[PDB]
Amino acid sequence: AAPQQINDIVHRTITPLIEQQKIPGMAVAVIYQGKPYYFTWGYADIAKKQPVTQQTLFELGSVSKTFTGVLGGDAIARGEIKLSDPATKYWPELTAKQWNGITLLHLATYTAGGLPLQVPDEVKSSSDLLRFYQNWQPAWAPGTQRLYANSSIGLFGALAVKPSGLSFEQAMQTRVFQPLKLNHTWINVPPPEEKNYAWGYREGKAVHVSPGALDAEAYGVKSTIEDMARWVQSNLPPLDINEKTLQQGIQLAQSRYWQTGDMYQGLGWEMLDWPVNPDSIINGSDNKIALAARPVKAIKPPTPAVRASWVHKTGATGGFGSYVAFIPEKELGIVMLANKNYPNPARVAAACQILNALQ
Ligand SMILES: [Cl-]
Ligand SMILES: [Cl-]
Ligand code: NI
Ligand code: NI
Ligand code: NI
Ligand code: NI
Ligand code: NI
């Protein structure tokens, strides 16, 4: 009766959402008792009437940060980094005084003291980046305010892989993607895979994410609905793989490092205690809140991953909108990929309706 029940709630929830939000193409995965169930609607390419399939690639936007968090967790477990390490330890030319006291933890969790949402578009090279961070003036002491920022976790990702001697992309492929068998997940989509790469749509124009500094670390992953379902499965408790630093790093990305309001900051992932007030995550997902500064309280030592949690992340690019959420206690989760950037609360409310019916 379970597959019939899943089909019904997914159909009755997503069909009106697509119509209300005018979404051109969408893929949904429900992870129910650890098993994935896939659903597709609409078009990856409107002009060519190419349907969304289980092999369609979507831009994950900020959901990419969950991969960066896990790769950072793997580096901790390898002994290559410590979150209490100063950021300057891995970038010694970053000598400016305001960086004294700023750690990898602060970069990973948006708590360095006001690093901006986007790296400025005029910053392109590594030397541009150095000048940007050397000249940046924090608004707050480190570890006091959370301000969501690609320039923060993006730099965390770039520094965390330095001890490996690998590029960020090589580290992600070899240490996260390949061990988890995510073989249709890319930082740079290869030419033969472009036939499955959906267009994003913004004001009715077909767009892909623009290149930018630290894009790979902060918002550059593209993936299929099947690989993202396998990503959810990999972040659920029963994961037991040969690559034990990765198994441990996944658990560390769900550690609770900071609290603000009723939410907890992990590495990439964000968490709330479950059962959760649905209005809190729906309302809190609005960018008028999610992009605003909020005071944080440190959790020392970080809370080890709590099984009774709602774990989630929204993401967007100019042309795409994504959402992933799961409940480790229930072995239950959802992935929603769309080639239009429609408002976060609509994504979260739909996910709440589906998972509440199945939990
Ligand atoms: Cl650590
Ligand atoms: Cl929003
Ligand atoms: Ni293939
Ligand atoms: Ni139940
Ligand atoms: Ni139940
Ligand atoms: Ni039950
Ligand atoms: Ni029950």
| φ and ψ of 235, to 5 deg | -95, 0
Q: How many residues does the chain have?
A: 359
User: CB–CB of 167/161 below 8 Å?
Assistant: yes
Handedness of CA 159, 164, 166, 169 (dihedral sign): negative
| Positive or negative torsion for Cα 155, 156, 159, 165 | negative
Q: Which pair of tokens denotes residue 12?
A: 């009755």
Asked if residues 314 and 344 have their Cβ atoms less than 8 Å apart, the reply is yes
> If you measure from the C-alpha of residue 202 to the centroid of ligand 3, how many angstroms do you get, rounded to a whole number?
28
CA of 313 from ligand 1 middle (Å) equals 22
For residue 129, how far is the Cα from the chain centroid?
A: 23
SS3 category, 69? helix
| C-alpha pair distances (Å), 186 with each of 27, 123, 183, 199, 258 | 18, 24, 8, 16, 30
All structural domains of the chain, each given as residue ranges with its CATH number in brackets, are 1-359 (3.40.710.10)
Counting ligands in written order, which one lies closest to the CA of residue 249?
Answer: 1
Which ligand lies nearest the alpha carbon of 315? 2
Tokens coding 298: 């440190």
3-state SS class at 63: helix
Task: State the distance from the centre of ligand 4 to the C-alpha of 276, rounded, in angstroms.
Answer: 15
DSSP-based three-state secondary structure for 2:
helix
Chain-centroid distance, C-alpha 306: 19
β-strand partners of 303 = 256
Distance 329 CA to ligand 4 centre (A): 12
Q: Are 329 and 307 in contact (CB under 8 A)?
A: yes
Q: Half-sphere exposure of residue 307, counting CA atoms within 13 Å on the CB side?
A: 5
Q: How was this structure determined?
A: X-ray
CA distances from 170 to 167, 175, 176, 315 (A): 5, 8, 10, 23
Closest ligand to Cα 332: 5
Q: Are 279 and 302 in contact (CB under 8 A)?
A: no
Half-sphere exposure of 117 (CA within 13 A, CB side): 6
Question: Please, what is the Cα angle at 103 between 268 and 124, to 5 degrees?
Answer: 70
Alpha-carbon distances, residue 212 vs 124, 165, 235 (angstroms): 7, 22, 28
* Catalytic residue IDs: 62
> Residue holding tokens 């990419």?
64
Distances (CA, A) of 149 to 50, 80, 131, 191, 205: 35, 24, 18, 30, 27
How many Å apart are CA 215 and CA 193, to the nearest integer? Answer: 20
Beta carbons of 217 and 267 less than 8 angstroms apart: no
The residues, ordered by sequence, that sit 6+ positions from 8 with a Cβ below 8 Å of its Cβ are none
Q: 190 CA distance to ligand 3 centroid (A)?
A: 11
For the record, the structure tokens of 221 come out as: 């992953």
Query: Which ligand minimizes its atom distance to the CA of 56?
Result: 3
C-alpha 10 – ligand 5 centre gap (Å): 17
